[PDB]
Each structure stands twice: as C-alpha cells, then as structure tokens.
A = this chain, B = another copy of it.
Amino acid sequence: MSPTVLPATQADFPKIVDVLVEAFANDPTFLRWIPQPDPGSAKLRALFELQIEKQYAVAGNIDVARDSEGEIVGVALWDRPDPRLVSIFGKAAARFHPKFPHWYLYTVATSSSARGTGVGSALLNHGIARAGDEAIYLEATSTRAAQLYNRLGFVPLGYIPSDDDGTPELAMWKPPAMPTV
C-alpha cells in the first residue's frame, strides 16, 4: 500500500509549501541561497511559494503523494522538456544540464512523519512513467540517493563544483530511448 501519486491542484499549494519547507528547512542545498538566519524559514517559504506559483504550476508538473488517510506526504517538482526576489535574497538565476531536451526533477520532498514509507519511490516512478521515452536530468545530493537513481536507469554525468557548500552534487541522466531503426 504505497502512496498514490497525482497532479496537484491549486487548493493543495499551501500544504505543498509546508512539506517543502519541512523537508528543506535545514538543507545546505537551500540554506546557501537564502541569507541567514531565516527565522521560521520565512524566506525559504517565500521562495517555494514563488517557484510553484510562477514556474511549476504554470509550465511544469507538480506531483503529490497522499497516504491512506488522504494527506499529502510528499511532493515532486518537474520541469518539462523545452522584485519579490529582493525580499528572498536581497539575486539568483542551467549551466550543467546537457544541451539536449530533457525533463528535470528539481526537488522531491517527503514529510518527516512519512519517512520510510516509499513516498520518494512512488513519486519517482510516477514521473519516470510520464517521461516515457524522453530523457531526465537530476542532481543527486548523496551517494545513497545516486545509487537509488542508478537502479532506476540514471547514469552519472559527474560532480558539480560547489562553492561555500556541502557535498558536491552528482549530476545524473536517464537517457532517452535509442532510435528504433
């Protein structure tokens, strides 16, 4: 009885942001962009609200996983193949993505309460099935995660250099289907 995955609806956006914030409140991957301290993760929260509203809701895919009690216990943000920022950063804005069409798995987050439930796996399987014959890029934040993604058909590209920051991320690629003939 693994969680069930569907596209988000607008009514779900508050909980979705709550889940992202809980997952990433102490993650170096996000802390590096947001000036610290960030009491109550308020600036991180604003970042996620903006990304959902102006990027993922619009031109991407937002998947949610729900448990058997109906609550959202995970979220994934995907990009498809192809002012308020002064308040979050006081300044941001690709380069290591291969220059070929691909899906991008930006983030996958699981509620603390739902750790060890197969939430992340259900999300990835959903997104991989949607991607089908097309390619996927992601950046794995641990060797453990990299090994999970490798078992799902991602091959390594290499490590992205980090300044200031924690573990270098391992860029990975799930290739597109080979040409039939």
Contacts and interface: CB of A to CB of B under 8 A. Distances in A.
Contact of A178 (B101, B150, B178): B150
Interface residues of A, number: 26
Contacts of A173: 155, 157, 173, 175
Contact of A147 (B102, B171, B178): B178
A58 interface: no
Contact of A99 (B95, B170, B178): B95
Counting every copy of the chain, the complex holds 2
Contacts of A171: 100
A114 to B, nearest CB: 27
Given A98-B98, A173-B173, A158 B146 contact: no
A175 B177 CA distance: 16
Contact of A143 (B95, B98, B179): B179
A95 B97 CA distance: 12
A34 interface: no
Contacts of A95: 99
Interface in A103-150: 135, 143, 146-147, 150
Contacts of A150: 178
B101 A158 contact: yes
Greatest chain B CB density within 10 A among A95, A100, A177 is at A100
A60 interface: no
B157 A98 contact: yes
Nearest to A150: B178
Contacts of A147: 178
Given A143-B179, A170-B179, A178-B150, A100 B155 contact: no
Greatest chain B CB density within 10 A among A146, A147, A155, A173 is at A155
